[PDB]
Amino acid sequence: MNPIILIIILMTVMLGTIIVMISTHWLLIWIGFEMNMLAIIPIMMKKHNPRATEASTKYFLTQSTASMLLMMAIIINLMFSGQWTVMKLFNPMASMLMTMALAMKLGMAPFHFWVPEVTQGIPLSSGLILLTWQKLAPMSVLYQILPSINLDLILTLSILSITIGGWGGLNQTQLRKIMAYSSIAHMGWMTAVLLYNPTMTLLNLIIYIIMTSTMFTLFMANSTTTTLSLSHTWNKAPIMTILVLITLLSMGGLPPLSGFMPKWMIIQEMTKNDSIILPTLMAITALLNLYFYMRLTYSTALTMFPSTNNMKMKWQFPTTKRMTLLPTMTVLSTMLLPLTPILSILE
């Protein structure tokens, strides 16, 4: 792609997310989502192979269906309220349709059927854009409509996302599908604490974006897209195995790491509201995520899978890659738990 056009298209993706974040009018929310989808489609088709075209077709169909349901929720709100302010919704039908639309845009289960497909089809950089930056505009709209979100719907979507994203990653050897089912489980964690304390929703979103950006930057820095090619990293750059070790143990929710920070706080806000069964099932179901994270740490860091002969040539060449903010994101994704009361800045 022409880099001026790449700059303009990425600024337009960012502009769509900002127009969703800053606007007080429902039509401008919908315009921001349309602009976001429309601009991110050529980021997915950066390589022009059939898998990117398939991923872009599936992504276009899911996000277009979600935006249709979003605009129908907006028009039913216009009927039952005569106004356009981005606030609570004045009808449970519009509340359900907008919650369905935002759950489709997040790829939360049972609308999850596009996130491993689309994430596998596209490159690692566009997969990073998909799993981090596209989880900011629907979480804005969910942060703004929580007086009208049905409790049973968002909790069913949340625990169904956590369970399905837990079981999905166990059967995977492709790193992008692992990160996609990890995305599904983590969006379930974020939306389960949405009606109890949305500050914990924002905390989980930020810590998740840090850890996911760390993992995709490590994958891009190692040029690995499968488990079995990530397993050659000890013979090429052994510090990267340590970084994926600490980041995957962080993403599993293990103390003393920062990925234990959101989970615990979510439990800390769900037991206040006399819900004991639900965060317990969520915590126990997160052990599946931890299990396929531990599978990746076994294949990469804790053992040494056999490499090839041609790796001896790659010993003679360093990385000329822009590993942008990789030590900063690696430190923030692992050693941030003693700074856990920083979450009050998200109030």
Partner: protein, 105 residues
């Protein structure tokens, strides 16, 4: 993340199409301008939790201005009872509900 840039910078990007009671072109009122003005001036600043129960009456009048559900239900009752009394023959319509009435102006 409602990063309220429009109030921080003082710009009016989309506050003008937000409600019906805003500044309209050529001062055109909506059909529910008074109802929406009463509901917004009731519910201003008291928060949504107090607004859902302390300004319920103005919002019910405004919603029934918008969709006219009670009005159309009452007209259903009046027209259905009128058609029943025509079918039973126990009522005849007046001449000003038939045309021959030499209308007002």
């Amino acid at each position: 993340p409602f990063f309220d840039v429009q109030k921080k910078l003082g710009v009016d990007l989309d506050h003008w199409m937000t409600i019906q009671s805003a500044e309209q072109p050529h001062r055109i009122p909506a059909r529910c301008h008074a109802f929406e003005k009463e509901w917004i001036e009731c519910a201003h600043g008291i928060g949504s939790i107090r607004a859902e129960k302390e300004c319920k009456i103005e919002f019910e009048d405004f919603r029934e201005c918008l969709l006219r559900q009670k009005t159309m239900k009452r007209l259903n009752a009046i027209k259905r009872q009128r058609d029943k009394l025509i079918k039973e023959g126990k009522y005849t319509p007046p001449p000003h509900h038939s045309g021959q009435e030499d209308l007002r102006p």
